[PDB]
Amino acid sequence: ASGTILLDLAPEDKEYQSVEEEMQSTIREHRDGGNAGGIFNRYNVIRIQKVVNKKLRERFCHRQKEVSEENHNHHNERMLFHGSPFINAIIHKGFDERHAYIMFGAGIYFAENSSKSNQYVYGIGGGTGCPTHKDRSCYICHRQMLFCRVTLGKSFLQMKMAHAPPGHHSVIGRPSNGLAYAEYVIYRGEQAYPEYLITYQIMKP
Ligand SMILES: O=C(Nc1cccc2cccnc12)c1ccc(N2C(=O)[C@@H]3[C@H](C2=O)[C@H]2C=C[C@@H]3C2)cc1
Numbered sequence: 001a002s003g004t005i006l007l008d009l010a011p012e013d014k015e016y017q018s019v020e021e022e023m024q025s026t027i028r029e030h031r032d033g034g035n036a037g038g039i040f041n042r043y044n045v046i047r048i049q050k051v052v053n054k055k056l057r058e059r060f061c062h063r064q065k066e067v068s069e070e071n072h073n074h075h076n077e078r079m080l081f082h083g084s085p086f087i088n089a090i091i092h093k094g095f096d097e098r099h100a101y102i103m104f105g106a107g108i109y110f111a112e113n114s115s116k117s118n119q120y121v122y123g124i125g126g127g128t129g130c131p132t133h134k135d136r137s138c139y140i141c142h143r144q145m146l147f148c149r150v151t152l153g154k155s156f157l158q159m160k161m162a163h164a165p166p167g168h169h170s171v172i173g174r175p176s177n178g179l180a181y182a183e184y185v186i187y188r189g190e191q192a193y194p195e196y197l198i199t200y201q202i203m204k205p
């Protein structure tokens, strides 16, 4: 069963404010002209909850400990965004690499820009948007994403692979041409904790 408890953050909470700040301030314009994630300069944040799960926390702490001693006591933790159709499963069971499907590999994908993760909320390339209106840019329907602690360890900089390279703990596609914004990939579910569940809407400009 799940040992997951959702704690509601009051909007007047400072923690609530730091999270939304991170989410708002990392919005970027993407190459697709808003095709996948929609068109917006801002979110409307409805809810932000802390995911509390003890066994999950320990699995994260145990792995981070291992990565640390593998990487000169640097676990290289970053707060990163995740988007996918499987948020509800993740807050209950945790990220699972066995659930990774076919992108740029068979791993778990994170973005430093919330708007990039927002592109995955309704599927790869935004699917066909919200269920009701089939609108990738719907300003009505509610969306969710995650703000996660991720153990990057020693990252590899690069197209499709199964695991991190020898001596590494994560793969990062850095902008170059090539990518517009960084993508962070891990191939072990316990190297990310789904810290905050964010429920939101995109706002019409
Ligand atoms: O941990 C994941 N899913 C799940 C965890 C635990 C229980 C589950 C039960 C059912 C389904 N998924 C579960 C999960 C793993 C990888 C992805 N994932 C990505 O992060 C990349 C790809 C993917 O499948 C897809 C293309 C880019 C993004 C979205 C999504 C969810």
Ligand SMILES: [Zn+2]
Pocket (backbone or CB within 6 Å): 130, 131, 132, 133, 134, 135, 138, 139, 140, 141
């Ligand atoms: Zn809709």
